[PDB]
Amino acid sequence: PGLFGGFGSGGSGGSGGSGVTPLSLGVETKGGVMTVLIPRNTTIPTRKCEIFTTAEHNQTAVEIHVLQGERPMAQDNKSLGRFRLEGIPPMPAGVPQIEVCFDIDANGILHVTAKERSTGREASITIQNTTT
């Protein structure tokens, strides 16, 4: 899926450790679908960049919901967090597409970012509770 969902649920659970991640890391896409970007059993640094194009109504900012799991529906995966990329034109009719990158460290640290193509503005979150 090449679009955005954005369920309000952040996480508020948290954890901590290192080694390998028990669940694969991905984003939520419209219709409640979970799109995996990073495979699990993470022991080495791993980068993924994916470009998502979508037409949203009255959009002032794009909110990326980050989860871990293997389930085809994001509803059934563990929500790690979310971040909202702001500075998007208020109602961008003709919006190009927002680039989301999942960067993984050797310690298995999940660093997610999103950058709007036309505006060039970016926002990033570092989730350090992915690994065991």
From Swiss-Prot:
Induction: By stress conditions e.g. heat shock. Disulfide bonds: none annotated. Forms a heterononamer with DnaJ and DafA in the resting state. Three copies of each protein are present in the complex. In the resting state, the DnaK-DnaJ-DafA complex cannot bind substrate. As the substrate becomes sufficiently high, DafA is displaced and an active DnaK-substrate-DnaJ complex is formed. Belongs to the heat shock protein 70 family. Cooperates with DnaJ, GrpE and ClpB to reactivate heat-inactivated proteins. This is Chaperone protein DnaK. It comes from Thermus thermophilus (strain ATCC 27634 / DSM 579 / HB8).
